[PDB]
CSV table of C-alpha atoms in Angstrom, one decimal:
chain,number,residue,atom,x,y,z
P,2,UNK,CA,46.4,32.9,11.1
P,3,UNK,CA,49.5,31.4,12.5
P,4,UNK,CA,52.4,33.3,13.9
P,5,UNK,CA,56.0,32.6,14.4
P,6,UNK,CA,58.8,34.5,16.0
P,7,UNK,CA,62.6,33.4,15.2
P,8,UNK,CA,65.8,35.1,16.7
P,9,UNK,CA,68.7,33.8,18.3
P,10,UNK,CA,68.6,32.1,21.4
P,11,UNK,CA,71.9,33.0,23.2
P,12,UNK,CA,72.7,36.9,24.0
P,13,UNK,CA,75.7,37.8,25.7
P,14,UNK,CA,74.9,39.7,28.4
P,15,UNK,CA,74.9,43.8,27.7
P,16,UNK,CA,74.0,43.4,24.5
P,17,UNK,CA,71.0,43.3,22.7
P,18,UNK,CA,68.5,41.2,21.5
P,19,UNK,CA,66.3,41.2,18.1
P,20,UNK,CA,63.5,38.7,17.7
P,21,UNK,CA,61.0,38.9,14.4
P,22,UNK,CA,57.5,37.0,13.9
P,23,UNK,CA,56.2,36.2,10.7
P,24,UNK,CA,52.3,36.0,10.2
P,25,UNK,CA,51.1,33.5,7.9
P,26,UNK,CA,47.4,33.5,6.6
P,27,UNK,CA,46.5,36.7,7.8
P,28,UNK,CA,47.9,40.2,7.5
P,29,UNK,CA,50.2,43.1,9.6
P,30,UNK,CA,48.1,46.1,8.4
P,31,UNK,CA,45.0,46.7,10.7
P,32,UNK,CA,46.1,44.6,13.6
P,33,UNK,CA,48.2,45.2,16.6
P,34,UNK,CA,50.9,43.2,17.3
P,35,UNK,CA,52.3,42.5,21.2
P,36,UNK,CA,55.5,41.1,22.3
P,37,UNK,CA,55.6,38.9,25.9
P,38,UNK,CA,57.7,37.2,27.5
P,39,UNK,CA,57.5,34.1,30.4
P,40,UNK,CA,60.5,33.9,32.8
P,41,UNK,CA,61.2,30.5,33.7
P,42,UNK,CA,58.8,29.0,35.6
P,43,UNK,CA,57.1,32.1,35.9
P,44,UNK,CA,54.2,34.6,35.1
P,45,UNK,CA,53.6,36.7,31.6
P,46,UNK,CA,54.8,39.9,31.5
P,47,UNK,CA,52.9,41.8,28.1
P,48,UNK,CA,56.1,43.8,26.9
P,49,UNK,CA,54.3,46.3,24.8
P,50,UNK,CA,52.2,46.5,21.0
P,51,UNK,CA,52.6,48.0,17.7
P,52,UNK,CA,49.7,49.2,15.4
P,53,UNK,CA,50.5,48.9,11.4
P,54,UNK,CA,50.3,52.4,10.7
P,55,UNK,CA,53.1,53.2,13.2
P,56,UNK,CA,51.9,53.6,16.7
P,57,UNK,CA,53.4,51.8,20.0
P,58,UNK,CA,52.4,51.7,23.1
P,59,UNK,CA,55.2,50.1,25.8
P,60,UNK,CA,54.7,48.6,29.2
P,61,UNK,CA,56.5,51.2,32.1
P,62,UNK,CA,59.1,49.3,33.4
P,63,UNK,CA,60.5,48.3,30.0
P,64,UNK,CA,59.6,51.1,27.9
P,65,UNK,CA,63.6,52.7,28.3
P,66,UNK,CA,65.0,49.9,26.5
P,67,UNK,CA,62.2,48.3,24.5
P,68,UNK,CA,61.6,49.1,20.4
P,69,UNK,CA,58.9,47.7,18.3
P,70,UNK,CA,58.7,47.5,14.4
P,71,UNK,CA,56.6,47.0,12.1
P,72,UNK,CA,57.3,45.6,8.0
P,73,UNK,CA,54.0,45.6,6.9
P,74,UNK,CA,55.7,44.5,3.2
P,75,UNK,CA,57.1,41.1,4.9
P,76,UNK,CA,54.2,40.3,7.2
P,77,UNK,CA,56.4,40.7,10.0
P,78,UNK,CA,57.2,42.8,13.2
P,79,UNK,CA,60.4,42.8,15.1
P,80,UNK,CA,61.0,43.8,18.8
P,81,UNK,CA,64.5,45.0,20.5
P,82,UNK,CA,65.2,45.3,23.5
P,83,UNK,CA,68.6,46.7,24.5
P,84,UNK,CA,71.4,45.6,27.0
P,85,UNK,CA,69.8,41.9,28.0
P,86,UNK,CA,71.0,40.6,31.6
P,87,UNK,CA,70.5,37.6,33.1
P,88,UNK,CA,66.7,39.0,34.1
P,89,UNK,CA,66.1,39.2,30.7
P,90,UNK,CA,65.9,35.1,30.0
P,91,UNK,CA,62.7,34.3,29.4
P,92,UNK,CA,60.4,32.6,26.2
P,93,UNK,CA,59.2,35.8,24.0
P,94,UNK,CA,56.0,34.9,22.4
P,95,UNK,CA,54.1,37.6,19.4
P,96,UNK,CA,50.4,37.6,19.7
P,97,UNK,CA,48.1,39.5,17.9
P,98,UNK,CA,46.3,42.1,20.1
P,99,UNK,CA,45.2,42.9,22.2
P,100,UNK,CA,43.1,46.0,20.5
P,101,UNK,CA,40.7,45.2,18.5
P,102,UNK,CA,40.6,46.3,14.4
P,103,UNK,CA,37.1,46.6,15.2
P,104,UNK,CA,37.2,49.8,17.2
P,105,UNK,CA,34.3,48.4,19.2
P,106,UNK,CA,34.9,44.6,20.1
P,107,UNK,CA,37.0,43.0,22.9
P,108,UNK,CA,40.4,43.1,24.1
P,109,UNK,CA,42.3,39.9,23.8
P,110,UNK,CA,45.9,38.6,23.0
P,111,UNK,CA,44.8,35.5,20.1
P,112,UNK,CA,46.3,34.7,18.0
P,113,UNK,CA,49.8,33.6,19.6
P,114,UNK,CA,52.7,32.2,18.4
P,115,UNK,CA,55.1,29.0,19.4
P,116,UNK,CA,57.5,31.4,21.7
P,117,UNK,CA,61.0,31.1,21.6
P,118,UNK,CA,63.5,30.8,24.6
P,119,UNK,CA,66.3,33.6,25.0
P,120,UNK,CA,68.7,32.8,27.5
P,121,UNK,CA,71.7,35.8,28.2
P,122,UNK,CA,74.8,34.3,29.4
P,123,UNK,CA,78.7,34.6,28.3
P,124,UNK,CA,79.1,31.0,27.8
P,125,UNK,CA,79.3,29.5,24.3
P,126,UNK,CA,77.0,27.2,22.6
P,127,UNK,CA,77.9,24.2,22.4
P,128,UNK,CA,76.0,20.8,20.3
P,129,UNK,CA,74.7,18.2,22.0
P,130,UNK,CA,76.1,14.4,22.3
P,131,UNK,CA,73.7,11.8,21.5
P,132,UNK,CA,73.7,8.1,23.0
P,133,UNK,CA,71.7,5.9,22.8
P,134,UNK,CA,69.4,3.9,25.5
P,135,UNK,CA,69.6,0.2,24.3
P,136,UNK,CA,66.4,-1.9,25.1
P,137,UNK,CA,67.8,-4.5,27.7
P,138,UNK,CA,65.8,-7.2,29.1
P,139,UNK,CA,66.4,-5.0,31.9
P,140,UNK,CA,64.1,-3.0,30.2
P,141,UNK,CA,61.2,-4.9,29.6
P,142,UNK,CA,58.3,-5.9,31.3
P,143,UNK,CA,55.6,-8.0,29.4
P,144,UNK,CA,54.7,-7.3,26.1
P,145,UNK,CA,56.5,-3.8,26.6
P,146,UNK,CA,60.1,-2.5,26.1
P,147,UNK,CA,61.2,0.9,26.9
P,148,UNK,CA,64.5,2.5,24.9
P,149,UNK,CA,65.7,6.4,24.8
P,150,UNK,CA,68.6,8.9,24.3
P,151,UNK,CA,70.7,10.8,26.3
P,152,UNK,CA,71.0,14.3,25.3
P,153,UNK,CA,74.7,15.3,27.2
P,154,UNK,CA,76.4,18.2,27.1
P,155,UNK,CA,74.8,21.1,25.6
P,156,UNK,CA,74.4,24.7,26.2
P,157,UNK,CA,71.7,26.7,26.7
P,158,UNK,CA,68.6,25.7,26.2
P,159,UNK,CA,66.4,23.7,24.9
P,160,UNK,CA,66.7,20.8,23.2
P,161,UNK,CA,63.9,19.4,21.3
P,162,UNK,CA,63.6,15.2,20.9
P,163,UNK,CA,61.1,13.3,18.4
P,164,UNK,CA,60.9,9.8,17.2
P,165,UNK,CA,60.8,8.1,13.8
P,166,UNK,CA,60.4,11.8,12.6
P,167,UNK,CA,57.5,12.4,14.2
P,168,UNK,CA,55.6,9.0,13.4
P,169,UNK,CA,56.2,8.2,16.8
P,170,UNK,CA,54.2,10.0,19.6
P,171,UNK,CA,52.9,7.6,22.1
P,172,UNK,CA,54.8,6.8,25.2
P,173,UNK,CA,56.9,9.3,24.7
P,174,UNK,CA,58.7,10.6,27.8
P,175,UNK,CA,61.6,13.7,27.2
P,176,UNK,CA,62.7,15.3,30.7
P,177,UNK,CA,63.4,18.3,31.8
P,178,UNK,CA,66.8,19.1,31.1
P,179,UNK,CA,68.9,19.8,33.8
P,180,UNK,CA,72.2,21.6,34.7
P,181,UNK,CA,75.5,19.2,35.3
P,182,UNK,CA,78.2,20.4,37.7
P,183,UNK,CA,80.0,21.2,33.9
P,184,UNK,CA,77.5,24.0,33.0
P,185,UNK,CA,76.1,22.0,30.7
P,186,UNK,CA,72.8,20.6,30.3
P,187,UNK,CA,71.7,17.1,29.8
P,188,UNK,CA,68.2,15.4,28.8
P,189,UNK,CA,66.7,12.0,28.4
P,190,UNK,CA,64.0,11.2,26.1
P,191,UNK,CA,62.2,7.4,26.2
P,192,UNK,CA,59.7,5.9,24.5
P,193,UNK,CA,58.1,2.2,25.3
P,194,UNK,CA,57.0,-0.1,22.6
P,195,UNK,CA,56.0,-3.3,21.5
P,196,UNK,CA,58.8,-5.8,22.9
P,197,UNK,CA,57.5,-8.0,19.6
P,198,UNK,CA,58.1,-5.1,17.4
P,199,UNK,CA,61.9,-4.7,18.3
P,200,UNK,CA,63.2,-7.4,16.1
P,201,UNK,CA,60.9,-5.7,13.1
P,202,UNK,CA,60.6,-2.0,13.7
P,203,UNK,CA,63.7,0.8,13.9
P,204,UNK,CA,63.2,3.1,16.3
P,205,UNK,CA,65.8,6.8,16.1
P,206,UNK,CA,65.2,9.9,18.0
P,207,UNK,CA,65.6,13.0,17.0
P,208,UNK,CA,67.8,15.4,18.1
P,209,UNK,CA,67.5,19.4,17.8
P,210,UNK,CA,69.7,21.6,19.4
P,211,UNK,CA,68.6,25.3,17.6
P,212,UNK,CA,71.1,27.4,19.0
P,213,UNK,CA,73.7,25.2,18.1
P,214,UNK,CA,72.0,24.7,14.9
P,215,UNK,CA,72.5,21.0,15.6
P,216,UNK,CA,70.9,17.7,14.7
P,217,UNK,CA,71.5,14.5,15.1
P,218,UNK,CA,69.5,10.9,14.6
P,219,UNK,CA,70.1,8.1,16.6
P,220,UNK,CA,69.4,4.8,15.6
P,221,UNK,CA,68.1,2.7,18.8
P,222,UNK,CA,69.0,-1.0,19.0
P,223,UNK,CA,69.2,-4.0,21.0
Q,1,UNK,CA,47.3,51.1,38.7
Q,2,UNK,CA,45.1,48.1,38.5
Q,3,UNK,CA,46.4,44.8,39.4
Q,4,UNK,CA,45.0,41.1,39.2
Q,5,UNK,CA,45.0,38.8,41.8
Q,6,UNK,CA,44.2,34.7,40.7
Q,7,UNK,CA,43.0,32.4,43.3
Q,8,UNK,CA,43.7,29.8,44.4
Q,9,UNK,CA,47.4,29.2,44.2
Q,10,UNK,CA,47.0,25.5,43.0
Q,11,UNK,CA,44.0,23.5,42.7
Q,12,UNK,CA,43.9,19.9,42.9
Q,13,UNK,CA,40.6,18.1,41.5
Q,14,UNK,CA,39.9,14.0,40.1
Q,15,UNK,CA,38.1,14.1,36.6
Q,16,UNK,CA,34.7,14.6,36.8
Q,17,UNK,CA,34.6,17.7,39.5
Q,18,UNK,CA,34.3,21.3,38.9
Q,19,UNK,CA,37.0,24.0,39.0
Q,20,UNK,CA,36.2,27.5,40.0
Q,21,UNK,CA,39.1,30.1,39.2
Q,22,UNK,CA,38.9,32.9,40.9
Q,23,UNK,CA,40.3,36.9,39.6
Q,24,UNK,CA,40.4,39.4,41.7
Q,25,UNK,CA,40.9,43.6,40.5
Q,26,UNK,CA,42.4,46.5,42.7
Q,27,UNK,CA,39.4,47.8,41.1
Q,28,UNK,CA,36.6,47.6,38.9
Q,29,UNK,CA,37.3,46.7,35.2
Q,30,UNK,CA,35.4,47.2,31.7
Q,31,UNK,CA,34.0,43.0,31.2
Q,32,UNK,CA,35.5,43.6,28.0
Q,33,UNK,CA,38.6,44.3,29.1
Q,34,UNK,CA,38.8,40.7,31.2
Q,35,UNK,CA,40.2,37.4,29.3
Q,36,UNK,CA,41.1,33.8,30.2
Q,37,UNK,CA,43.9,31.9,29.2
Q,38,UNK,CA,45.3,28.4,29.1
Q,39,UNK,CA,48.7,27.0,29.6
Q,40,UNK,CA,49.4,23.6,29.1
Q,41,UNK,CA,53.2,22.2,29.9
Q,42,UNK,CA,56.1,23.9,27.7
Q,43,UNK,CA,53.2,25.7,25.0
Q,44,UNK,CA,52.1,28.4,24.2
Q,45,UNK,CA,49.5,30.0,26.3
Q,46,UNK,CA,45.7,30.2,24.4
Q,47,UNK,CA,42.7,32.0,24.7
Q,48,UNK,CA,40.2,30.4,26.3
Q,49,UNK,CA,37.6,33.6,27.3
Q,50,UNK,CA,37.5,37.0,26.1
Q,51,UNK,CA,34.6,39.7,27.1
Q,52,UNK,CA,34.5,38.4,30.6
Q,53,UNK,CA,32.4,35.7,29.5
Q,54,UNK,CA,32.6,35.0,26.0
Q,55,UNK,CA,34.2,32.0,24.6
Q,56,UNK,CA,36.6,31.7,21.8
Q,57,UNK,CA,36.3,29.7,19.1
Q,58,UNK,CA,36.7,25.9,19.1
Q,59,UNK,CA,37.2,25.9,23.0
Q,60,UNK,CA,35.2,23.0,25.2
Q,61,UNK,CA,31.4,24.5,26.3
Q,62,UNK,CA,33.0,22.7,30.1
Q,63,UNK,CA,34.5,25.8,30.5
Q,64,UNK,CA,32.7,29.4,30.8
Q,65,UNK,CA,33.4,32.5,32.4
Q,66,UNK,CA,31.7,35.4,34.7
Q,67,UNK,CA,31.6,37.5,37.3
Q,68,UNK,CA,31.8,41.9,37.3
Q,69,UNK,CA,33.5,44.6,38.7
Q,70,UNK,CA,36.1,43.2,40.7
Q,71,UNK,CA,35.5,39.4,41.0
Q,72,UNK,CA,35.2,37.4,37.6
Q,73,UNK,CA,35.6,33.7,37.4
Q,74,UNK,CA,36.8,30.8,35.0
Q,75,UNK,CA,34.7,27.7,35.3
Q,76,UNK,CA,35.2,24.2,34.1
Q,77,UNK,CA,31.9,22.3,34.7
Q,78,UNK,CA,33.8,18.6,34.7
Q,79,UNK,CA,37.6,18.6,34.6
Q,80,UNK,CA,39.3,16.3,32.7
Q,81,UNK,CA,43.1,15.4,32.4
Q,82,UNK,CA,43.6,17.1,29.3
Q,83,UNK,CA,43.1,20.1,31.5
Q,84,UNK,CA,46.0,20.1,33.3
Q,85,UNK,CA,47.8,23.5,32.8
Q,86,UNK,CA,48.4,27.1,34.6
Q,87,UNK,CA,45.2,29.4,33.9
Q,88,UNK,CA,45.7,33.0,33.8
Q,89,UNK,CA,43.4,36.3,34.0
Q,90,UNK,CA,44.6,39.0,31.9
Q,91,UNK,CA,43.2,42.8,31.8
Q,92,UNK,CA,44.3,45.7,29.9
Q,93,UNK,CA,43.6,49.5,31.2
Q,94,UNK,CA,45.7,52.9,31.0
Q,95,UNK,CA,47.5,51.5,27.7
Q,96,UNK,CA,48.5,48.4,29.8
Q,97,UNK,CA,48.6,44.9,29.6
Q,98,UNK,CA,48.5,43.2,32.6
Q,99,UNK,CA,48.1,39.1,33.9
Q,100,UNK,CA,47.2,37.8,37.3
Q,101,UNK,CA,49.9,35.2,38.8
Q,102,UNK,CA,48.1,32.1,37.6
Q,103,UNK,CA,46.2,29.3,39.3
Q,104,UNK,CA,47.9,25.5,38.7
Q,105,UNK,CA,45.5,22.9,38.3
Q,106,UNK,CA,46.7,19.3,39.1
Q,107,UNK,CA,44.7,16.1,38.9
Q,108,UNK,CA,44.4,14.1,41.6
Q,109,UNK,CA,44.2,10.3,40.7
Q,110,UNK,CA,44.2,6.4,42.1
Q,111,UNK,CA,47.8,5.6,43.1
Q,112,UNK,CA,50.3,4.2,40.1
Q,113,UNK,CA,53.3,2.2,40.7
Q,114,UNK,CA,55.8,2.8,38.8
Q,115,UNK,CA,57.2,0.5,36.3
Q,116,UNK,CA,61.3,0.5,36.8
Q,117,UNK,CA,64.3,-0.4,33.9
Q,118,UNK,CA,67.9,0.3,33.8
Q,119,UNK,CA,70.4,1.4,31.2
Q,120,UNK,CA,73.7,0.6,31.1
Q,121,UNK,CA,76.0,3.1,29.5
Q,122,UNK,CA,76.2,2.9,25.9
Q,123,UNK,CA,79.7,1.8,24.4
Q,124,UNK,CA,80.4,5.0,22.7
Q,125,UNK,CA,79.9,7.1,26.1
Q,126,UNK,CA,82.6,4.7,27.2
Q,127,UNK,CA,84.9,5.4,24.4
Q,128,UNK,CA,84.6,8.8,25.4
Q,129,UNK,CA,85.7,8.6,29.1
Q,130,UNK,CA,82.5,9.2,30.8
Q,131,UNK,CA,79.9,6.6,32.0
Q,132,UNK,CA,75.7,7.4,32.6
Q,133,UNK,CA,73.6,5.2,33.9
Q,134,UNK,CA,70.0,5.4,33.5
Q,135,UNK,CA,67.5,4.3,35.6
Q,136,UNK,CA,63.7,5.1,34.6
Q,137,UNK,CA,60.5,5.0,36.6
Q,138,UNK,CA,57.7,5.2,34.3
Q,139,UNK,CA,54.4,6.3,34.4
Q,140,UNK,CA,52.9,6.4,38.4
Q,141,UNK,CA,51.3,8.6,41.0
Q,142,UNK,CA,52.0,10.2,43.4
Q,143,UNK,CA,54.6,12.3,42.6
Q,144,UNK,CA,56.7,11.3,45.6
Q,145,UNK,CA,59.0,8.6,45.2
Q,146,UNK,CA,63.1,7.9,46.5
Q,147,UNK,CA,65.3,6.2,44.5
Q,148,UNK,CA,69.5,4.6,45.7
Q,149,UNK,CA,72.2,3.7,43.7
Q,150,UNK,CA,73.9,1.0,44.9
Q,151,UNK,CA,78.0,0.2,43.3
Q,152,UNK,CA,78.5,-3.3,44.4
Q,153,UNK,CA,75.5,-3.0,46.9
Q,154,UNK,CA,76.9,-0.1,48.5
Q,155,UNK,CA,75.0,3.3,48.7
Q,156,UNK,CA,76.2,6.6,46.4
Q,157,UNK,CA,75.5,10.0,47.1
Q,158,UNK,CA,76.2,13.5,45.3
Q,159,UNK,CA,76.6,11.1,41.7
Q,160,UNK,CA,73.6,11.2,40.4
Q,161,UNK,CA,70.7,13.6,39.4
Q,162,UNK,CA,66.9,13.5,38.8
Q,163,UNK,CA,64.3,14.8,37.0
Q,164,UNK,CA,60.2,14.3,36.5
Q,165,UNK,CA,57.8,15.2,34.2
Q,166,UNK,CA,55.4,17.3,34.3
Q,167,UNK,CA,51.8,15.6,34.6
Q,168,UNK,CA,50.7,13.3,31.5
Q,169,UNK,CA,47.5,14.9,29.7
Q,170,UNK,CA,45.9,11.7,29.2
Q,171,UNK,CA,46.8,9.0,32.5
Q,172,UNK,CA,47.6,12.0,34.7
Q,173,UNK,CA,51.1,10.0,35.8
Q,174,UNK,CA,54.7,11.2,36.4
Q,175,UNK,CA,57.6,9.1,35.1
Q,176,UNK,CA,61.4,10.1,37.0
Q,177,UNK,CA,64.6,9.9,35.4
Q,178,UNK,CA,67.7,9.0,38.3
Q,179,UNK,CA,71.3,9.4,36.0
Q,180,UNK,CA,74.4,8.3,37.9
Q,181,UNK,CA,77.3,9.8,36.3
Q,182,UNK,CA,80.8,8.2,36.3
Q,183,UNK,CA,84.2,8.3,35.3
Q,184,UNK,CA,85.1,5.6,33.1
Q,185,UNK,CA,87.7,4.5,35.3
Q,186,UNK,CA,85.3,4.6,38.4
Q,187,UNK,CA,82.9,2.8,36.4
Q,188,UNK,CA,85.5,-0.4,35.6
Q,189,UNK,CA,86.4,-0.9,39.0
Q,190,UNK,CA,83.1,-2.2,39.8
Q,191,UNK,CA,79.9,-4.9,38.7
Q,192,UNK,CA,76.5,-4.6,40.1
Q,193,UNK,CA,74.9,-1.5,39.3
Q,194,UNK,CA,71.7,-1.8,40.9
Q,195,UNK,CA,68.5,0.8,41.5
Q,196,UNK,CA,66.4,1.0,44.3
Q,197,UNK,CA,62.7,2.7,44.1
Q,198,UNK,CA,60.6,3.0,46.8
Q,199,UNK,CA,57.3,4.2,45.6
Q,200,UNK,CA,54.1,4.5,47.6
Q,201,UNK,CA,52.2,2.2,45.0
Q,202,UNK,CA,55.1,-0.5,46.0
Q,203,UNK,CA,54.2,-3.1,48.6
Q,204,UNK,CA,58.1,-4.1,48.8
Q,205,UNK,CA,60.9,-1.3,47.6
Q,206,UNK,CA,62.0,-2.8,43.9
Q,207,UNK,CA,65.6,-2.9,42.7
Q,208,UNK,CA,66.8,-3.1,39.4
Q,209,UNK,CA,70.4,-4.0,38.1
Q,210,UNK,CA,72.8,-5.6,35.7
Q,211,UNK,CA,76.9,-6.6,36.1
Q,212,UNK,CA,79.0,-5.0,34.1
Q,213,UNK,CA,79.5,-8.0,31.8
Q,214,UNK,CA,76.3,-8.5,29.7
């Protein structure tokens, strides 16, 4: 039973946000379904549950402003929580739980989903740039090359970088993204391979800016 | 209320030795109210034990939980670097939900040096009036390290920014990222680019660099 939330990612602050997961291989009706949230670089705060037939149950210090439903003919429950601030940017995850169908049986948030990251700010979104980190003999060193490519300029958060589609996994480095004097962020992502292989092989990243609904593909050369 | 308290803060441990997570509850707590869970680097947390001590399905016999009342405990018999992540306690009562803070779990590991290239600004960044340059130190430990640019062998400040990643699941390492941002204009009125990384794993500071006219 796999899970998956989707919603936007960018709420101006005030207003309010609406996030839905869809279950996949299992079923809504005689689970409960929780909402949580991780702020940045922080601890999980459980946001509150739905049963299928109806019932919720939210945490205290959200309860004024949170709403769960359920659409048990979609697979699907949606949360809302009303007039999002700054506080309010965190990664919302759905996880099934944490009561039991089974009246009698533990208490445990599983399954969860992928989480998605909901940052509240004014600013507008904006793609990213894509360049490319050419392999140099400045950036080799035996029989290994390394190559990337800078992610510039985009707003919020996050970016996601693969290579060759997702062929190529190994050696893989994409940093934290971090926050230019612009109010923009900006990433790197690099991968090392064989230095015999960059005459033969094509290496392109992958660029995925969701919020922006942006992608781009790089091609990598010498 | 009832609130959980995860001990300690951050652990540090080499493969091979045992990790024992502490939980502590502002009172007594229901064993099947008491789960485990595991958060590895920007993921999803998952279920590790449920039932105080049972655990889930398809998770490593390494780790096993126990403890009553107010002290239960997370156990991983040998670490290994696959298990570095954030490990949180989680307990529901009164029609609440609640987690501890979390214990970190780094691995400790023989010192790496780091392996250092450079990246001149592509020729489309140029085109667009703005100049990065990239300087990488891949894969070393420990996390400490210092890195200069130097214009023309002289030292910049407030131009460039860093970031690291988090530790690697399989070596353990950390690999930096140094970007020195220019103008275009800035950028032309000058040759050497060169970076300097002084590492603990270095015996003599290494500098990498390129002129502006490859």
């Amino acid at each position: 039973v796999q899970l998956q939330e989707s919603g936007p990612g960018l709420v101006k602050p005030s207003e309010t946000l609406s996030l839905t997961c869809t279950v996949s291989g299992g079923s809504i009706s005689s689970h409960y379904w929780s909402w949580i949230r991780q702020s940045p670089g922080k601890g999980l705060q459980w946001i509150g549950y739905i049963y299928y037939s109806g019932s919720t149950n939210y945490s205290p210090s959200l309860k004024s402003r949170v709403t769960i439903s359920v659409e048990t003919a979609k697979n699907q429950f949606s949360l809302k929580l009303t007039s999002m601030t700054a506080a309010d940017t965190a990664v919302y995850y759905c996880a099934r739980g944490p009561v039991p169908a089974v009246f009698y049986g533990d208490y445990r948030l599983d399954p969860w989903g992928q989480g998605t990251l909901v940052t509240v700010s004014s600013a507008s979104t904006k793609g990213p740039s894509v360049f490319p980190l050419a392999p140099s003999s400045k950036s080799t060193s035996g029989g290994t090359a390394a190559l990337g490519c800078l992610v510039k300029d985009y707003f919020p958060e996050p970016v996601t970088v693969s290579w060759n589609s997702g062929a190529l996994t190994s050696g893989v480095h994409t940093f934290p993204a971090v926050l230019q004097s612009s109010g923009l962020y900006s990433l790197s992502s690099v991968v090392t391979v064989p230095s015999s292989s960059l005459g033969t092989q094509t290496y392109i990243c992958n660029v995925n800016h969701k919020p922006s609904n942006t992608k781009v593909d790089k091609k990598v050369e010498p | 209320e009832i609130v959980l308290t995860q001990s300690p803060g951050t652990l540090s441990l080499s493969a091979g030795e045992r990790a024992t997570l502490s939980c502590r509850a502002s009172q007594s707590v229901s064993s099947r109210y008491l789960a485990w869970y595991q958060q590895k680097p920007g993921q999803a947390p998952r279920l590790l034990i449920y039932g105080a001590s049972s655990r889930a399905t398809g998770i490593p016999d390494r780790f096993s939980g126990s403890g009553s009342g107010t002290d239960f405990t997370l156990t991983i018999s040998r670490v290994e670097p696959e298990d570095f992540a954030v490990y949180y306690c989680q307990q529901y009562d009164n029609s609440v939900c609640t987690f501890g803070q979390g214990t970190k779990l780094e691995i400790k590991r023989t010192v790496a040096a780091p392996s250092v290239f450079i990246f001149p600004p592509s020729d489309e960044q140029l085109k667009s009036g703005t100049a990065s340059v990239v300087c990488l130190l891949n894969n070393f430990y420990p996390r400490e390290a210092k890195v200069q640019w130097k214009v023309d062998n002289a030292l910049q400040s407030g131009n460039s920014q860093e970031s690291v990643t988090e530790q690697d699941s399989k070596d353990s390492t950390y690999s930096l990222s140094s970007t020195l941002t220019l103008s275009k204009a800035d950028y032309e009125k000058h040759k050497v680019y060169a970076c300097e990384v002084t590492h603990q794993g270095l015996s003599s500071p290494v500098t990498k660099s390129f002129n502006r006219g490859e």
